[PDB]
Amino acid sequence: MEKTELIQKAKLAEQAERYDDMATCMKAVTEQGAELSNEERNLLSVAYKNVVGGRRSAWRVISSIEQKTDKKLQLIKDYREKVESELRSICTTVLELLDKYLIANATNPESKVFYLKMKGDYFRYLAEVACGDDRKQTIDNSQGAYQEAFDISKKEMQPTHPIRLGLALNFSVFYYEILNNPELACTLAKTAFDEAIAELDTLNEDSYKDSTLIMQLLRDNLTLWTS
Amino acid sequence: MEKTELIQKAKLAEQAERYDDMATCMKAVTEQGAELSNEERNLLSVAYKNVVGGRRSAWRVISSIEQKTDTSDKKLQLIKDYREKVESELRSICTTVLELLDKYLIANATNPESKVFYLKMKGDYFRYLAEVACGDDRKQTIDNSQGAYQEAFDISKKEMQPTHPIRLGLALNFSVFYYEILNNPELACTLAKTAFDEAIAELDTLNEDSYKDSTLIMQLLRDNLTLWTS
């Protein structure tokens, strides 16, 4: 199938909430070799986010059930391990796409920041279910990706840009969730929010939608973390 | 594995919303050969409703996009082929369910409650096949659906009070079969409203555990009547 027809089928599956098909479509597009527009980057992100988040939620439910718990517990742990295997498979797929095709051949600083943020996201998802030295290394990779994206974004992008804001949001979550420091996650979210507000009168209309929403989310986290 | 482990695993899948695995578990349970309890029939129903509803929704969206575009276009052939893919896997799901119903469940059902339940499931899934069938396959699926519904409707009229939630769900789905498949709004409304009224008369004499389900189903009957009247 051809790129245009391929992303057509991707949007089609998206509107049908068939995220596995959408994800395979976008993987094919990426493996074709060409770079992605902002809309196509979004398609890939949404597709793989849905497919991995089904299993993230399942894993949380199952691990919770396990904590409150017996042959039952053995079955619970085996099922959790199955879900973890599926999650690692998905994350490895996404990370391989990022290393080989997307990050390597990215033209813009914005695309590089986007793909680095995504790498941070999926190493974080791998770390959510890691133990031992594997956990250390996955946390290391997630933080490294986020920090590189952060440095490049503040070097080449304005604070109001939606990609920078989303990076701040997910990096703050990484600080609060993986490293477990509420103060630093709060400070990151708040510095992003305030820096965006400082300009704002410069933000162009195309981004009004994304930025605004993201900023709300920032503020929401800061509210959830001050209680 | 024996029933106990399958039931635990299916229930854990339901909690995790892994409906594919739940469906696999309950298919194994059914194929063990023994009769199912109400817990197990609810697990089977929930699981398979969940695995088939995603395909139904995808198909509805895809077909609304198909008829909402211009004709004689190459863009259109891709959409039609995708619709055919989802139709194929939906038909495979429905065939799995109907095979379980024809080989194990209905045949060995011992009480009228389970008979009504399995015949209602037969009608439901043959209706799911009908909503995507054409011509002679459509006629076949509609006839089978209606026959199953009618047998369940008679068994229920003869063996259940008008408040039993299974009888009321049967009436709801059978009226919906009349409105969507047969394109008969008047008889759909009549069936649904008759179930409603006969239920309302005897409501004070009823169990709370059944009250929740029954009042839910009656509320749904009223909503369908309001939609069909408009």
Next chain:
Amino acid sequence: YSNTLPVRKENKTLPRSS
């Protein structure tokens, strides 16, 4: 949980999907 991006996503009959 803390917010992150991106986020995940007729007549009435019974049963209904969750």
